[PDB]
Amino acid sequence: RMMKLSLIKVVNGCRLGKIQNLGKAGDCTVDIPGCLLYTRTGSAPHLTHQTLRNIHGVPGIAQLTLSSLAEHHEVLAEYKKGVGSFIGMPESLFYCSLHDPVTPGPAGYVTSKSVSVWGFGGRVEMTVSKFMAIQEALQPDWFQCLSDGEASCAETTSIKRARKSVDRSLLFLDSCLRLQEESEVLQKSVIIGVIEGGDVMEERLRSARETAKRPVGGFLLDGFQGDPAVTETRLHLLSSVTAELPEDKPRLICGVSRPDEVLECIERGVDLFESFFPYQVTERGCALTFTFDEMTSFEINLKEKKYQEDFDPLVRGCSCYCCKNHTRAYIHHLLMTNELLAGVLLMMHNFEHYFGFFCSIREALKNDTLAQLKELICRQMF
Amino acid sequence: MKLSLIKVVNGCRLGKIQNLGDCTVDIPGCLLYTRTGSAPHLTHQTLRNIHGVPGIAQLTLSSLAEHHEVLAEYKKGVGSFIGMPESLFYCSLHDPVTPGPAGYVTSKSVSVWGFGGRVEMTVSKFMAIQEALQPDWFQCLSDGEASCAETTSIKRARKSVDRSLLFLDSCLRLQEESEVLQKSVIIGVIEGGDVMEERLRSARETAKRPVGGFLLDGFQGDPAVTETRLHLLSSVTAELPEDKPRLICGVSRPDEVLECIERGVDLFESFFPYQVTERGCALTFTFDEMTSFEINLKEKKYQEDFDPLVRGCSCYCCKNHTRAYIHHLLMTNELLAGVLLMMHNFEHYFGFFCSIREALKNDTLAQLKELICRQMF
Numbered sequence: 042r043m044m045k046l047s048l049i050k051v052v053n054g055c056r057l058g059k060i061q062n063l064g065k066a067g068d069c070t071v072d073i074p075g076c077l078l079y080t081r082t083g084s085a086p087h088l089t090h091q092t093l094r095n096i097h098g099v100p101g102i103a104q105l106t107l108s109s110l111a112e113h114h115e116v117l118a119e120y121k122k123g124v125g126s127f128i129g130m131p132e133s134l135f136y137c138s139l140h141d142p143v144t145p146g147p148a149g150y151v152t153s154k155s156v157s158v159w160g161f162g163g164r165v166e167m168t169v170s171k172f173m174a175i176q177e178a179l180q181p182d183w184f185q186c187l188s189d190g191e192a193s194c195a196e197t198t199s200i201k202r203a204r205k206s207v208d209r210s211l212l213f214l215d216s217c218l219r220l221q222e223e224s225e226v227l228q229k230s231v232i233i234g235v236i237e238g239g240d241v242m243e244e245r246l247r248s249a250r251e252t253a254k255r256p257v258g259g260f261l262l263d264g265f266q267g268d269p270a271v272t273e274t275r276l277h278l279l280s281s282v283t284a285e286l287p288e289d290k291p292r293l294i295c296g297v298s299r300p301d302e303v304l305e306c307i308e309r310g311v312d313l314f315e316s317f318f319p320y321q322v323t324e325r326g327c328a329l330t331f332t333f334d335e336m337t338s339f340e341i342n343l344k345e346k347k348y349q350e351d352f353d354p355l356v357r358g359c360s361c362y363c364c365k366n367h368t369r370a371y372i373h374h375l376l377m378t379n380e381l382l383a384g385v386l387l388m389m390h391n392f393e394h395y396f397g398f399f400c401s402i403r404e405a406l407k408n409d410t411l412a413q414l415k416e417l418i419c420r421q422m423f
Numbered sequence: 424m425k426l427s428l429i430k431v432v433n434g435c436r437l438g439k440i441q442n443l444g445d446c447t448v449d450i451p452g453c454l455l456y457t458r459t460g461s462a463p464h465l466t467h468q469t470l471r472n473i474h475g476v477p478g479i480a481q482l483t484l485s486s487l488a489e490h491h492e493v494l495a496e497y498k499k500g501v502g503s504f505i506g507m508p509e510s511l512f513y514c515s516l517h518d519p520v521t522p523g524p525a526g527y528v529t530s531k532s533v534s535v536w537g538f539g540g541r542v543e544m545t546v547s548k549f550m551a552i553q554e555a556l557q558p559d560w561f562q563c564l565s566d567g568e569a570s571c572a573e574t575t576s577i578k579r580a581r582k583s584v585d586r587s588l589l590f591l592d593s594c595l596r597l598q599e600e601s602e603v604l605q606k607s608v609i610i611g612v613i614e615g616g617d618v619m620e621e622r623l624r625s626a627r628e629t630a631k632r633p634v635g636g637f638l639l640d641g642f643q644g645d646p647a648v649t650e651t652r653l654h655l656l657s658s659v660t661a662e663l664p665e666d667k668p669r670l671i672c673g674v675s676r677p678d679e680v681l682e683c684i685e686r687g688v689d690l691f692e693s694f695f696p697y698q699v700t701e702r703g704c705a706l707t708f709t710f711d712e713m714t715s716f717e718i719n720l721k722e723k724k725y726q727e728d729f730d731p732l733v734r735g736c737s738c739y740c741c742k743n744h745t746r747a748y749i750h751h752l753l754m755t756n757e758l759l760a761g762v763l764l765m766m767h768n769f770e771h772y773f774g775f776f777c778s779i780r781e782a783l784k785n786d787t788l789a790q791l792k793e794l795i796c797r798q799m800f
């Protein structure tokens with residue numbers, strides 16, 4: 042409950058559908074497969090709430106991260122009306138992840154009693170009760186449960202480390218559920234259970250099976266993120282895990298946002314992705330250009346002099362604010378003259394492009410043409 | 424262009440500049456501060472959501488001269504280049520916030536400094552750049568560095584006057600031969616430094632040329648225009664014709680602005696609210712490095728302050744957000760803070776000029792001046 046996931050069809054393991062009645066007011070509808078708006082603190086990077094509304098296709102749910110907010114627990118707790126109200130958008134929908142995928146901290150601070158996050162001012166150690174107190178201050182519609190995602194950070198794959206991540210995460214889960222039952226302000230918030238177990242198949246499946254026994258609203262597939270992309274072994278692990286999860290609850294994944302990875306994960310039953318990739322592209326002065334009808338092959342770098350006299354838009358036929366009004370040469374000029382407006386403009390285009398890519402995925406699932414889209418993406422990446 | 428004065432109260436000129444031929448600029452007033460043609464932090468859509476935005480924007484050779492070749496290849500002018508082809512632009516020589524070092528003026532060339540370094544401009548290089556930019560108004564190449572010398576000397580002041588008249592007559596000649604600069608207006612620059620006689624000679628000689636207006640150069644002060652230079656300023660403006668606008672550069676703080684309006688100056692740069700924004704501050708002074716007119720949102724005392732920046736402000740930030748929110752944006756290292764502060768600081772500064780003009784209409788400027796200076800201490 043607390044949301045209604047309906048599937049239109051499942052083509053080659055890809056789940057095409059929508060999640061209805063979600064959020065604290067139970068009135069938002071999200072399409073799947075889909076992404077969440079990437080933010081750190083609840084406000085989109087570079088973008089006023091009004092400017093964000095000038096981007097086409099903005100997702101119905103925004104991500105914010107405990108990493109960046111945990112230091113401000115005292116202010117938000119005294120304020121008590123929640124993050125949405127704090128930023129001047131009470132009607133917004135928020136999923137609160139534990140970590141910022143763009144800037145994760147060092148490994149090795151997880152114990153059976155606490156998990157640490159790193160914000161702008163440094164490290165914050167969270168017991169279960171400290172973590173739930175923060176959630177009571179933030180009041181997100183969805184929140185990732187406190188979890189141990191560091192089994193794969195060990196030098197080798199060991200049963201003991203994988204087993205511990207499963208058991209720690211279930212202990213955290215049952216404790217947070219208990220504290221949520223006793224909380225006036227978290228009654229309409231939904232906890233997301235976290236699948237752990239590292240690279241050990243049996244512990245992965247046990248984590249999936251045990252987590253699904255709890256009344257979580259959905260599941261976060263944790264620990265599959267790859268450099269540069271999810272490895273083939275972890276894709277196999279992924280579809281084994283999703284096969285054990287109930288079909289009527291959404292599957293989220295963290296740390297997976299690049300278009301080729303996204304498609305591999307959709308094929309293996311993942312529904313919802315973080316959109317930090319276009320933010321990373323913006324931060325290095327780049328624009329996403331890949332067609333869907335370190336810097337990657339999906340993008341151009343507007344700092345390069347070859348764009349100083351390129352009076353074409355970032356993407357021809359793009360209708361974002363930047364491509365409606367500006368050229369490559371202009372954006373290059375803004376970067377050269379060190380005008381921060383460049384970051385605003387790139388963020389608008391990169392979000393709009395990335396969200397359009399997800400719209401295109403869903404159309405491909407409808408038309409049963411996903412395999413051609415996938416080859417199109419991977420031809421641009423090589 | 425046609426300047427018409429509604430009234431002149433106590434030396435203050437209230438009026439409007441028309442035929443700019445569908446745009447109007449109110450005087451006394453400011454120009455929108457930009458470096459490259461785009462308002463700092465603000466998309467053109469966001470800028471149009473600010474009340475009271477001036478009819479003409481300033482841009483500077485400091486940031487543009489280095490990209491002459493791009494703009495010449497583009498051909499359609501800077502307003503078209505930045506996506507605002509219908510907008511009005513005044514091109515000044517230097518960026519008032521970051522003009523770069525002094526000591527690079529000769530009788531043959533003047534230098535500006537941008538992100539990529541020094542750009543040295545002879546008269547013909549300067550006019551070629553203006554042909555690429557195609558601004559509606561432009562400051563003539565000029566020697567504004569007489570007062571930068573270690574002392575006041577007749578010889579240095581005389582050179583600033585004579586160099587500037589020679590640049591002026593050469594630029595006028597080149598403009599007459601320029602099809603694309605035919606609809607552009609040249610602004611003559613009064614120089615002469617701190618020597619009364621050379622200031623007056625610069626004023627009288629510059630007014631003999633058919634310039635569209637005058638730029639009062641070399642009066643800028645730290646923290647504000649000195650009393651000696653205010654005396655010098657009013658001696659100069661007394662020599663200028665009344666029916667042409669007077670601009671001043673490097674003078675933007677509200678107390679300085681009011682002193683210069685009293686002495687017949689019409690148009691000011693609006694870099695002050697940009698400076699306020701860049702140090703994480705908000706203007707709060709009433710008009711019904713950090714100065715007394717402002718609050719500093721990085722300070723912890725605002726972390727739980729759930730009032731707007733300014734009660735009753737109509738800007739996007741004060742209509743929707745709290746001080747505590749802005750403080751949090753700064754603390755969590757979000758450039759969105761700068762966008763919102765710039766929106767408010769421009770809106771507040773533009774409201775201040777609206778209030779100046781209202782005070783001239785009602786003959787109550789002296790009360791506004793005292794209200795401002797009381798908050799400056």
Ligand SMILES: [Zn+2]
Binds near residue numbers: 361362364365
């Ligand atoms: Zn675009």
Ligand SMILES: [Zn+2]
Binds near residue numbers: 733737738740742766
């Ligand atoms: Zn305001």
